[PDB]
Design a protein around this ligand. Structure first.
Ligand SMILES: *[C@@H]1O[C@H](CO)[C@@H](O)[C@H](O)[C@H]1NC(C)=O
Lengths: 50, 30
């Protein structure tokens, strides 16, 4: 939901920890052009822990 | 301190993988 994203050469990174990783809120945004996952499965991503 | 305007305990910054905040004659600790 950020209003401005950084450029690709100066990409900004945020750390997510000590919270409830509810990935279901991501789907409320616009339809994603690409949602390729590697290793992890988006269907049961909430079931695993990281 | 000469309030508490200096934190020269550390010299630089790094990963900073974790952060936690809470409330602070004999006080034992383990
Ligand atoms: C968050 O997304 C909504 C649309 O899903 C948008 O209307 C809103 O402006 C966004 N928030 C910010 C702070 O831009």
């Amino acid at each position: 939901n950020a209003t401005t994203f950084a450029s690709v050469y100066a990409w900004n990174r945020k750390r997510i920890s000590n919270c409830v990783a509810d990935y279901s809120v991501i789907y409320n945004f616009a339809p994603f052009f690409a949602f390729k996952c590697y290793g992890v499965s988006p269907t049961k991503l909430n079931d695993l822990c990281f | 301190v000469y309030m508490e305007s200096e934190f020269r305990v550390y010299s630089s910054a790094n990963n900073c993988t974790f952060e936690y905040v809470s409330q602070p004659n004999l006080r034992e600790f383990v």
